[PDB]
Amino acid sequence: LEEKKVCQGTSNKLTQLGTFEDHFLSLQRMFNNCEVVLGNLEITYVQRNYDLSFLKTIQEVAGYVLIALNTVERIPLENLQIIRGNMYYENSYALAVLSNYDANKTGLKELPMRNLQEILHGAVRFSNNPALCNVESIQWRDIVSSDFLSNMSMDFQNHLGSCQKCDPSCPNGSCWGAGEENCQKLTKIICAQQCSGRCRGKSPSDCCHNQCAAGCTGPRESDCLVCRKFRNEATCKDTCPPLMLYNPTTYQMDVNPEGKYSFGATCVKKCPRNYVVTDHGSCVRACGADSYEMEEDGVRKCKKCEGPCRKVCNGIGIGEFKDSLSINATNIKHFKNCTSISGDLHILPVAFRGDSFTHTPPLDPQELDILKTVKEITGFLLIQAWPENRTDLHAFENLEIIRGRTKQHGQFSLAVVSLNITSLGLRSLKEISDGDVIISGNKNLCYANTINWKKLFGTSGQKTKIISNRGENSCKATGQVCHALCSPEGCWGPEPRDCVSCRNVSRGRECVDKCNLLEGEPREFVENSECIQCHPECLPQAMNITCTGRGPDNCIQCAHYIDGPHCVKTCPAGVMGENNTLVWKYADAGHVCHLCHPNCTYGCTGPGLEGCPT
Amino acid sequence: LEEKKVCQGTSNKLTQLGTFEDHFLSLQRMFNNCEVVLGNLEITYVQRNYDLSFLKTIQEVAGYVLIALNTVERIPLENLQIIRGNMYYENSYALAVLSNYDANKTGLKELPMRNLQEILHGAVRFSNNPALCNVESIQWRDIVSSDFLSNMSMDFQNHLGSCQKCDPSCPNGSCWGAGEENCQKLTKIICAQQCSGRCRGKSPSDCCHNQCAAGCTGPRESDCLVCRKFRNEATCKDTCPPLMLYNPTTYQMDVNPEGKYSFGATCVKKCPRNYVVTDHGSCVRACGADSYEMEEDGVRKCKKCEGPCRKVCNGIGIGEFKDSLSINATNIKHFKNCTSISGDLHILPVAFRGDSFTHTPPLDPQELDILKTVKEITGFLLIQAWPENRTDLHAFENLEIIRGRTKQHGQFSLAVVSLNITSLGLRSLKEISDGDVIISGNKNLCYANTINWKKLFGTSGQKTKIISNRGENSCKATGQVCHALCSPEGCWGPEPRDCVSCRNVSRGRECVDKCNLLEGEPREFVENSECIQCHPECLPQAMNITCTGRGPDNCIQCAHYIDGPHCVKTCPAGVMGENNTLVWKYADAGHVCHLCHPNCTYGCTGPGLEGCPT
Amino acid sequence: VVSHFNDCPDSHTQFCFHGTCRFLVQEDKPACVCHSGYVGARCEHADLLA
Amino acid sequence: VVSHFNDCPDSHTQFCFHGTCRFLVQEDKPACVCHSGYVGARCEHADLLA
């Protein structure tokens, strides 16, 4: 189908993930059955005699390509067509091939990237691999973009024996391997003199479209091999078709019958329901500093800010927190009073233990309470270390929505791994709009799967992974099942104030089985199954109820004077009225006060002027 | 130069404006010395032996082309290249050549449109015009579009075949009449299928850009003969480069360094001063009903309205009004409470007389007061009729602004011709944002050439035309020079209520001789030659002045009591204060207001408890 | 014989504001003859440009 | 036998979170060795897909 299988790539630079045959497994796990790498493509520490045959299906790399200290003889990356270079290794390059020999001058000899034809951004570095040969004559100005040819480093010193040749059926002995197919096919420095782009022949009759990125198979925009900027359903456009076009005839606007939303690198019909939709038509992650998000009739938009244009806080890995790992004790003050993290929160053990490499002093676990005002996170939440004295996620008792725009390892939106906390304790979570949920490795944590997680999610295809916690059959032993009040729905904790739906009534924010309807000072009512108390000055009766409403009127009788349908401790004795009069109101036997005579303004005990001494 | 001389184009289909030699003279007076017809090209009644050598400069016709009832030998339209076919003649055609023979077969001989290559819209019609030779052989599918060929109606039955058959040197026997050059230069049905647009040769090395309308000189987009949709500084774009580009990686938006505002048909870097700059950078006339106009920093925009918007009314000629010529008796009820006219305003003599043809009754002269709420006019204002017993423009009495986006005859904004009124009466017209003002034909109207219009236009390049109203001596003798108080600047009528400027002390909308300083009924003060009534609480000073400002703070002596800096009618007695504590004051010796005792809650008539009754 | 124009039928009378109607017969369509100083497809407007 | 590896210098000590540092010398850049169950250029994160 027209959806090439994608992967997430790696971001290890030179790190080895265990033993030589435990690194290759992690390599095989991520890159097997791949067609479009969305991240990077690291192939490092792949020792002799391993079968890297799964690479013959990769066709793009939307980052860089790093081939580190391998020893295998041949890497079958003979289908790579383009390296978009969205992220540079060493801040300069987008294809690095470094030191592919173990210790004694043997190892990687062949590397037949015969289809590689374009590198949209970044230079290329070869260095220090004295076994790779026949990549020594490739004209590197046909592949690299014409801008970066000043920043390319190349060092070919294949001084290990010799190797085969490549016949003169290819341009001036420029070959990628040894054979007929493994030799370069130029498309940029053989073109005609009237096509500013790629080509497929030494003629103006077959110059390619302006939007083809590696070389066309036809002289149109629907025949490009790899699209350069966008992709409008098998047509490599330049900008997605707008929603409203100008009208030169009438100086007005119109509506495009075919207008799509710009979702990242493709023209989609409608933005995903958890992305900010601007007016132009664009799935923005978090719109401008001025505007502020606000839910429309089923979708999210954002409008301008009037008066106070409140601050927004960037998460980790973006903004001024570009190369920060956790919320360490040098950027926690920047979260002083946030209510929405326009990003994603990483908490790692380096936050507490404190680092020495990048001069970062340790954290005070009391400072972690500043997060108690956060109300929603647009990206994801990755918790990896908590104060051990703590028994629950206390700093997040107000978290309400995890949007799930940025994700961890491209899959997870809520990760709680390897923690020492007895109960999860997010007693205000409502919706995890997108992503997955992993909660594993908590050696003593009971309440993880009692919650019906299938109703916090809001998008089809969301799974949950909850293993290796404290076994359920042990929570039953030590008497740790949640309270008898919480409905059979879930319980974020043992306390009654931590349920998800109180079975009968909820006094404030804690579950109870019966409001006080006859006894107890707070004689309340069960409106909306929430015990709500009334005016204290209402008469308490042991047989009948006290009140049926917050207003001081619904009460049967009153503990003090009554003024018509409403009663209060004392009836008017100098209150303000209408037309600038001091309204006074004298009492009666049954406490039914009556308005005083308009003469006297001091006191009132009898009807009219019978309570006006001098 | 960088721009081409533009005509304006006629719109009278088959009308003969006078006699044969006044028609031609009015024709020559327009299409002389220009190269682009922004409107329509109409050539009718050009009887034999009149020279048409002034048509050889026209290169484009942004409307239709009608050529009827001529008898001249040759209509030299050699240099015409494209007919954008925006409008249409008879609802179908964009080039009509019909009935070009007087009565004796001395018809139109040769129409050598040898450069006419592309007709962007509409079909073509030739009918009933003998003596026209060799145009019957042109292949029209090379010219008309591929979806308008089902409407082309053309018959050729030239009796007097005495005319030269063309050379064989041009394709398929398709010539325009004579000579080696009048032979069709095909550019569309000879391109190889590799080409998308039009070409300049059969080889696939000749395709022109997609925006080349007629043809091309080179293979790029900067070589088009004439652009198809837009024109970005000698580069025929298709949509103006947007102001903000969508970053495909970080899902955000970035400011385009080369963005331009799309003003009509040319990408400009700044909208005109009287055009509302929409959000996504496109100079537009009037935006959608969901929005409403608003000004800021001297430019205009329009934003969303709170809930339902107000009412804005389309002018005459725009939108639903296309059958209408003026505000006839029918459509006048649609202008109920329009505070603006997003359109035009034509008042023709037919409105008051009664249009028998298009089944509408005569207008009641009193009904022309519905237009007293109109405060601005986006387009122009054309008045040619009035209930000639009212000697002023009594309807447009509070009118304030004429934007003049659309103009009459492409040059005029305010047009008051052929009236029987005595004074203008537009005593509130403050600015004419764009256009030119004409006031002629008014047989008895004197107070017009007294207003210095130069301070009403704002935008330079505007000229009035005020001619043949009344010889100043013909009303100087009857004293019809306006009042001696309308200060030297201008004058709209004979009353003080009409002067535009104002001397010594104006009283709002009226000029006066002096201020009510010292005497008068209301005390006043002077600032910027305007007097505002002193606060009612300042004492009438029969000696010196009374106040130095509007507020009671600038009085020389308060009439009643004095609560600190302010002059009050009665010291406060119930005003909200701090900590929800009321405020009661009293008047002492010098009528000064001082606070009560914190205790005295019923107020007090004296200091402390020794003042409130107890 | 010299017949391209005839009198205006009794349904397009008062159809021409500032001119006199005349019904050219070739295409059965009326055509005003505006007086000196009025343009428009129906002798509607006053020519403000000369 | 050229080492191609030598002990991590005393400037990137404690630079590796969940692994052991080491200095591959050929290109003058350090490189962690993550334990089983930790990914990241600096052995920072935990491979949640495990």
Curated annotation (Swiss-Prot), chains A, B:
GO terms for cellular component: basal plasma membrane; basolateral plasma membrane; cell junction; cell surface; ciliary basal body; cilium; clathrin-coated endocytic vesicle membrane; cytoplasm. Phosphorylated on Tyr residues in response to EGF. Dephosphorylation by PTPRJ prevents endocytosis and stabilizes the receptor at the plasma membrane. Dephosphorylated by PTPN1 and PTPN2. Monoubiquitinated and polyubiquitinated upon EGF stimulation; which does not affect tyrosine kinase activity or signaling capacity but may play a role in lysosomal targeting. Polyubiquitin linkage is mainly through 'Lys-63', but linkage through 'Lys-48', 'Lys-11' and 'Lys-29' also occurs. Deubiquitination by OTUD7B prevents degradation. Ubiquitinated by RNF115 and RNF126. Ubiquitinated by ZNRF1 or CBL at different lysines in response to EGF stimulation; leading to recruitment of the ESCRT machinery and subsequent degradation in the lysosomes. It catalyses: L-tyrosyl-[protein] + ATP = O-phospho-L-tyrosyl-[protein] + ADP + H(+). Disulfide bonds join 7-34, 133-163, 166-175, 170-183, 191-199, 195-207, 208-216, 212-224, 227-236, 240-267, 271-283, 287-302, 305-309, 313-338, 446-475, 482-491, 486-499, 502-511, 515-531, 534-547, 538-555, 558-567, 571-593, 596-604, 600-612. Belongs to the protein kinase superfamily. Tyr protein kinase family. EGF receptor subfamily. It is found in: Cell membrane; Endoplasmic reticulum membrane; Golgi apparatus membrane; Nucleus membrane. Endocytosis and inhibition of the activated EGFR by phosphatases like PTPRJ and PTPRK constitute immediate regulatory mechanisms. Upon EGF-binding phosphorylates EPS15 that regulates EGFR endocytosis and activity. Moreover, inducible feedback inhibitors including LRIG1, SOCS4, SOCS5 and ERRFI1 constitute alternative regulatory mechanisms for the EGFR signaling. Up-regulated by NEU3-mediated desialylation of N-linked glycan at Asn-504. This is Epidermal growth factor receptor. Binding of the ligand triggers homo- and/or heterodimerization of the receptor triggering its autophosphorylation. Heterodimer with ERBB2. Forms a complex with CCDC88A/GIV (via SH2-like regions) and GNAI3 which leads to enhanced EGFR signaling and triggering of cell migration; binding to CCDC88A requires autophosphorylation of the EGFR C-terminal region, and ligand stimulation is required for recruitment of GNAI3 to the complex. Interacts with ERRFI1; inhibits dimerization of the kinase domain and autophosphorylation. Part of a complex with ERBB2 and either PIK3C2A or PIK3C2B. One of its GO terms (molecular function) is cadherin binding. Glycans are attached at residues 32, 49, 104, 151, 172, 328, 337, 389, 420, 504, 544, 579, 599.
From Swiss-Prot, chains C, D:
It comes from the Eukaryota. Residues 4-44 form the EGF-like domain. Residues 1-50 are extracellular. It is found in: Secreted, Extracellular space. Disulfide bonds join 8-21, 16-32, 34-43. This is Transforming growth factor alpha. It comes from Homo sapiens (Human). The lineage of its organism: Eukaryota, Metazoa, Chordata, Craniata, Vertebrata. The chain holds residues 40 to 89 of 160 of the full protein.
